[PDB]
Structures are given as structure tokens and as C-alpha cells.
């Protein structure tokens, strides 16, 4: 294969820049203390297990998906269902709220991303378009704007679409195994992608080719999320650890791993400033990791089943952690 | 406050209508039975036996590695497992897949029904020697009929030694690690969708009845 001279070159490229790491610098940084967060609300009313949720840009309306075939759009302030959409396929696996607020996308095991139109002049909600072309199960779709949606399927492929025509504009291929999650950058020109091969591939939207491939994990990667600066991203896996990678350095920086956690992270998201790193585990908890000293400084233990999704508002005022008990709490 | 009250009331007027629809949908979601039909290595089929709604969700448009999308099927009442007992060596792949479903972290509360298909083609498989049952399972050559359980009439003592050997081969997997509410229901079938839905309904009743007896701690 003649890739050995290319196998060693990046390995010494990571070693030549691995000087004075993040653990050595933040020895002088003061800690944050134990952070008491209590369940402010409890948005009960789902039937089956909540599998995904996404916050609005207005930080008031959150959409949630579950296996019963419903797509509720709650109001987080008043605990009121603004819409309840009857889905076609029951086994949905992700949901996304458009940054304009007009549309909501939800597609799962039926290999089809369905764009719903909540801004319909007629009150009844309806499917705007019905994307198709993927073969595997759909894992995570997110909205760029009201015209472009990039999704992640289980056939080792990410695809960038245009909604008005229903065509794959750009198909991102190069992964091995099922792609599990997705997270857009704040400039929305790049996005990282974690798959079931212990590698989180960073993609370019307007190109279709992997910019850099980061591999420091050792099991299936279940969730990913950018840093607010856009120069880094955390990554949760089934390894029961989180790893804060870096774009400009192309190596891992921290390793958020305690000794007692024998349970894979299913969801991970930063705070508004990125000082905290809220991660949703499989032991029914949400361990808040201080993302600069890698010491756990908080536990959100309200649920009695495993947390599926974990969203943080755009202004940093609340945290919603859905779970498999059909209950979606709103922490603070 | 009063200008904020009518918009709150209109939000309340939509919430009460949405809560009205969910109570009409909860009593039909909790009344239907979800299934799952996967083989040894159409997406939704709905039938009904004795006024009970069955939702046999059939996968098969997905890929082969199934460690991620089978976690969605933990709330399913029963996972229908159909094997190809005629085989190359599809039987060992069906056995190791059953070991991974039974000992899964999230599927250890979901029972599994078995449908040992390819039945009559196994009768000629033990005589031809293309894929012999002794070639992949040589312990069958010393294994005899386990008990005096009556087989189907019009059969040979060799072929009923074969298919009952496939039965407790799977019962060795299930009875070894019992922690949860899973129960293995083996059956001997030849073709699907002919009298087998009675065998699914009679066994899906026993999962619901054992679910309520577990709630009262009677079992």
C-alpha cells in the first residue's frame, strides 16, 4: 500500500506539536465549584421513549422526537405543546429546528428525511418535502438555513441537500461504519462527523472531501458537538470517555474520563462560553465536566432511564435533557 | 397582563386541543403490539388476530452491522427471530446473533420468539451431504432425542433428532444468562403467514401477562 511513510509522518507531526498540553497549562486555573442545577420544568406528555431533541434559536421553543410517531414542539417557558405532528414512520431517530424557525425536519429508520412546514398559512401542519436517496437509517440531520439541510445516515455517508428540489447536492463519503451524529460549526462552512470507527472526520460543506480525520477514541462514537469558538469540538463515544479534539492542532487535548463510569456517552454539548461540557451518560445521569481541567463538577440525575439527547440553548440560560422515560426535563 | 392573557389563552386553547388528541392516540398506541422481524443475516406489515393490532416492523433496507439500530427496538413486545435451519453455515451465524441479542444491555428486557424455518429442506439436507449437520455440529452425531415429546407425525426418527437438536442449541443460549424479562419461545414452522400468526398471538399474550405479574411481584 506504500502508506507507511505516510503513516509515520502525521504521527511525528502530532508529536512535534504536542508540547505544554492543556492539562499542564490549566494547573493554575481556579476550579468552578460544584454547580447546583435543579429541574425547573418537566415537559411530560410523550408516549414512547424520547430519542432526540433540538433547541430553537429564540431559546423558547424546543422540538422533541420519540418512537410513538409524534413530534412535539413545546414552549419551554410555559410548558405548553404548540404543535403535535403525527409522523408517518414511528421509528424516528433525530429532529432539527430551523434557525429561521419556519421548518422542522424529522427522519429516522425509514431512510427518509421529512421536512415539515410549521409556518403554513393554513394551521394544519404538513410535509414540505420528502428527501430520499439514503439507504441506511438516518441518524442526525441539522439545518444550515431554510434551503440547505445536511444529514447523516447509516450507510457511511453524509449528504448535503437542497430542499426546494430534493436532490443530494453534495455527498460526503469516506467513513467506515455507521455515522451516528452531526454538529455544525458557528460559521456553518464546516462540520465534524463522528461514526462507528473511533474517528471523527471533519468535513467541508462546499467541497465533499474530508479535511482532517481525528482518531483518538477506541469504540463507537455516539455524539459530537462543536466548541463555541469553532476551533475545537468535544466527542462522546461508547468508551465511557469524552475527548476535546482540536482543528488547528489535529490531536486530542483532554480526556474526560472518571474511573467509575462503565457507561458510554450518548449525548454531549458545551455551554454558551464552553467552560462546561455537559455529557449524557448511560448510567441515567448527566455528568457536567469542567472542560478546562477535566474534573467532574456536577451531576444532573433526575431521570430514571438513559438520556438520549441533551440540548443547550443559544443564550446559555437553560439545558434540556431528554431521556428514554418519555420525560424531558429543563435544567438550569 | 390582560393583553398577555388572550395570547396565553390562545396558547392554552391550542394546548387543550392537542392534549385532547394525545389521549385519543395513547389508547391506540398502548393497544397495538409492535413486533420486529429479522432473519439470519416492505418496511411495515400490519395484521390483526382476535381484534388486537399487530405492527410487524420488518427491517431489511438497512446494512448488515446492527449494533446501533437494534437499540431502537427495546420497547418492542417481542422480537421475532427466523432462522435458516438448512444451513454456508448460516446456522452458526444465526446462533451467535441470538447470543448478542439475548445478552445485550438494552435488549435484556425484550423477549424473543423463534421460528425455525427451512424445515422440510433440512430433511433432505441430512441425507445429501452438501452442508451436513454433522459437518458443522459433530456433537449431533452422539446426540439423540432429548425427551418423549411427541414430534409431528409422518416423520423419520433422524429428522426429528435434527430439528430438536437445533431447539435446545438455542435454549442453551437463553437459559444460561437469565436476568430480565426475556423469554425464548421456540416453534417449528415451514412457511410464514399461514397459521403462524396464531402462534405469534398466543405467545405475545404470555409476554403481556408475565409483564403484569412482574409489576405486582407475583413472578
Amino acid at each position: 500500500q506504500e502508506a507507511e511513510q505516510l503513516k509515520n509522518q502525521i504521527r511525528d507531526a502530532r508529536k512535534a506539536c504536542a508540547d505544554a498540553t492543556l492539562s499542564q497549562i490549566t494547573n493554575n486555573i481556579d476550579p468552578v465549584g460544584r454547580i447546583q442545577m435543579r429541574t425547573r420544568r418537566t415537559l411530560r406528555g410523550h408516549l414512547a421513549k424520547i430519542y432526540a431533541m433540538h433547541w430553537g434559536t429564540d431559546s423558547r421553543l424546543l422540538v422533541s422526537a420519540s418512537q410513538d410517531g409524534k413530534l412535539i414542539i413545546w414552549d419551554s417557558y410555559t410548558t405548553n405543546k404548540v404543535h403535535a405532528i403525527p409522523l408517518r414512520s414511528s421509528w424516528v431517530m433525530t429532529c432539527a429546528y430551523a434557525p429561521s424557525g419556519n421548518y422542522v425536519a424529522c427522519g429516522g429508520l425509514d431512510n427518509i428525511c421529512s421536512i415539515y412546514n410549521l409556518k403554513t398559512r393554513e394551521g394544519n401542519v404538513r410535509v414540505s418535502r420528502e428527501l430520499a436517496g439514503h439507504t441506511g437509517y438516518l441518524s442526525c440531520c441539522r439545518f444550515l438555513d431554510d434551503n440547505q439541510i445536511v444529514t447523516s445516515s447509516g450507510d457511511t455517508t453524509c449528504a448535503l441537500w437542497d430542499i426546494e428540489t430534493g436532490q443530494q447536492t453534495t455527498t460526503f463519503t469516506g467513513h467506515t461504519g455507521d455515522v451516528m451524529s452531526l454538529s455544525l460549526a458557528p460559521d456553518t462552512r464546516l462540520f465534524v462527523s463522528g461514526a462507528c470507527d473511533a474517528s471523527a472526520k471533519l468535513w467541508d460543506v462546499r467541497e465533499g472531501m474530508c479535511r482532517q480525520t481525528f482518531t483518538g477514541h477506541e469504540s463507537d462514537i455516539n455524539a459530537i458537538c462543536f466548541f463555541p469558538n469553532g476551533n475545537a469540538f468535544a466527542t462522546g463515544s461508547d468508551d465511557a470517555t469524552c475527548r476535546l479534539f482540536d482543528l488547528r492542532a489535529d490531536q486530542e487535548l483532554m480526556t474526560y474520563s472518571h474511573d467509575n463510569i462503565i457507561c458510554g456517552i450518548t449525548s454531549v454539548s458545551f455551554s454558551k462560553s464552553g467552560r462546561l461540557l455537559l455529557a449524557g451518560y448511560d448510567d441515567f445521569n448527566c455528568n457536567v465536566w469542567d472542560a478546562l481541567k477535566a474534573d467532574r463538577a456536577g451531576v444532573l440525575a433526575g431521570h430514571d432511564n438513559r438520556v438520549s439527547c441533551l440540548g443547550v440553548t443559544d443564550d446559555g440560560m437553560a439545558v434540556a435533557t431528554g431521556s428514554w422515560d418519555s420525560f424531558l426535563k429543563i435544567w438550569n | 397582563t390582560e393583553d398577555q392573557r388572550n395570547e396565553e389563552k390562545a396558547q392554552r386553547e391550542a394546548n387543550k386541543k392537542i392534549e385532547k388528541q394525545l389521549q385519543k392516540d395513547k389508547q391506540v398506541y398502548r393497544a397495538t403490539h409492535r413486533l420486529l422481524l429479522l432473519g439470519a443475516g416492505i418496511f411495515e406489515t400490519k395484521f390483526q388476530v382476535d381484534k388486537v393490532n399487530f405492527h410487524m416492523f420488518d427491517v431489511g433496507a438497512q446494512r448488515d452491522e446492527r449494533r446501533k439500530w437494534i437499540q431502537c427496538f427495546n420497547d418492542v413486545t417481542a422480537i421475532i427471530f427466523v432462522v435458516a435451519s438448512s444451513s454456508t453455515n448460516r446456522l452458526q451465524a444465526a446462533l451467535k446473533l441470538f447470543d448478542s441479542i439475548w445478552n445485550n444491555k438494552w435488549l435484556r428486557d425484550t423477549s424473543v420468539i423463534l421460528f425455525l424455518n427451512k424445515q422440510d429442506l433440512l430433511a433432505e439436507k441430512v441425507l445429501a451431504g452438501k452442508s451436513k449437520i454433522e459437518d458443522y455440529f459433530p456433537e449431533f452425531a452422539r446426540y439423540t432425542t432429548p425427551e418423549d415429546a411427541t414430534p409431528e407425525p409422518g416423520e423419520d426418527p433422524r429428522v426429528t433428532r435434527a430439528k430438536y437438536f437445533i431447539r435446545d442449541e438455542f435454549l442453551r443460549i437463553s437459559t444460561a444468562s437469565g436476568d430480565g424479562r426475556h423469554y425464548c419461545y421456540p416453534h417449528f414452522t415451514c412457511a410464514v403467514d399461514t397459521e403462524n400468526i396464531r402462534r405469534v398471538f398466543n405467545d405475545c399474550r404470555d409476554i403481556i401477562q408475565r409483564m403484569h405479574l412482574r409489576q405486582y411481584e407475583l413472578l
Partner: nanobody, 128 residues
Framework: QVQLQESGGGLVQPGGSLRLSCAAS????????MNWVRQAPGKGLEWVSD????????SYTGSVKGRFTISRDNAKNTLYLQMNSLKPEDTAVYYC?????????????????????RGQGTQVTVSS
């Protein structure tokens, strides 16, 4: 980087013996099951054997039971399958295959697709 370097293999006369060494580097080796998956030429992938973390439930497929012994060393991060009394039907490429996740008792690694935690594969052959 999860990589499974495999050694051994080659041409061995039938009825003889051979030893394979799965050199695993890139993970905590004492936390996962480890399997051996073989691929006969022109046939699909077939599961051969498996071993636990320290080794307590060792199983084999029935065609090679009593002839192959799988052993692991959690201090050297190396997995050994000892071949003895070879048959011509054992002519296959043998893949070391870790299980998907840690501290678990359920693996899904017989897949024909590019499984991510499976080695490159070494080839064993029989002679006349």
C-alpha cells in the same frame, strides 16, 4: 487508533500445526472480548472462536472444536490461536476481531462489510 496486526500463517502441510499472534495496539486490551473470524475463499465470513476479558467463557464453532485453542495475554496485549491437526477445509484468511464495546457480553463482528475493529488478515493454506 484501533489496529490489529496479525502474524503467523503461511503454507502448512495437512495434519500439521500453526500458531497465530494477533498483536493488538491502540486500546486497553483487558476490557474487551476478542474473537477470531475466518473467511474461506469464495465464501462468507464465519465466526470461529471467542474469548472473554481474562478468559472464562471460551467457545468455538463445532467444525474446529477440540482442535483449536485460543489464548490471550492481557499484559502483552496479544491474542493467540493455536492450530492443531489441520484439515484442508481450514484453508482460509483469519481475521482478529475485537468486539464493538467494552465490559460487554454481546458482539456483532461477523459482518461482510468493513468492520472497523477487525485486522487486515493473514492467510493459512494446506498442501498436498
Amino acid at each position: 487508533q484501533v489496529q490489529l496486526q496479525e502474524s503467523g500463517g503461511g503454507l502448512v502441510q495437512p495434519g500439521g500445526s500453526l500458531r497465530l499472534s494477533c498483536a493488538a495496539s491502540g486500546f486497553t486490551f483487558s476490557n474487551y472480548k476478542m474473537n477470531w473470524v475466518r473467511q474461506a475463499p469464495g465464501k462468507g465470513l464465519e465466526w470461529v472462536s471467542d474469548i472473554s476479558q481474562s478468559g472464562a467463557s471460551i467457545s468455538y464453532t463445532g467444525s474446529v472444536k477440540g482442535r483449536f485453542t485460543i489464548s490471550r495475554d492481557n499484559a502483552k496485549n496479544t491474542l493467540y490461536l493455536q492450530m492443531n491437526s489441520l484439515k484442508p477445509e481450514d484453508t482460509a484468511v483469519y481475521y482478529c476481531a475485537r468486539c464493538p464495546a467494552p465490559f460487554t457480553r454481546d458482539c456483532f463482528d461477523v459482518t461482510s462489510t468493513t468492520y472497523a475493529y477487525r485486522g487486515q488478515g493473514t492467510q493459512v493454506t494446506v498442501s498436498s
